[PDB]
Known about the structure:
Order of helices and strands: EEEHHH
Family: In the N-terminal section; belongs to the PqqC family. In the C-terminal section; belongs to the PqqD family.
Protein name: Bifunctional coenzyme PQQ synthesis protein C/D
Strand content: 5-15%
Region (PqqD): 3-94
Largest sheet: 3 strands, antiparallel
Structural class: alpha+beta
Radius of gyration: 13 Å
Subunit structure: Monomer. Interacts with PqqE.
Function: The PqqC region is involved in ring cyclization and eight-electron oxidation of 3a-(2-amino-2-carboxyethyl)-4,5-dioxo-4,5,6,7,8,9-hexahydroquinoline-7,9-dicarboxylic-acid to PQQ. The PqqD region functions as a PqqA binding domain and presents PqqA to PqqE.
Strand order of the largest sheet: 1-2-3
Number of domains: 1
Amino acid sequence: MEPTAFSGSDVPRLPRGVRLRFDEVRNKHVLLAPERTFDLDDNAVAVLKLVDGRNTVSQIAQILGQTYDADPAIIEADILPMLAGLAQKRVLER
């Protein structure tokens, strides 16, 4: 009754029956949800695709942060709230 609470130690992981897909026509990544599909940015799916299994947002922020050369604090703070939004769609679970 309160899935909107992803902390730094909270590691994201895609649930079974879900796969990532890249739309060349739209040039953006989307999440295949049992219901249908949701429009998402490559950056939001990048971390989900870059992670082999369960990684800490802070850790990803470092690697991803160096890619765009930006303060990791912003990067982690960007995806962090995204996890809560995804949970509402029933496609993410700690």
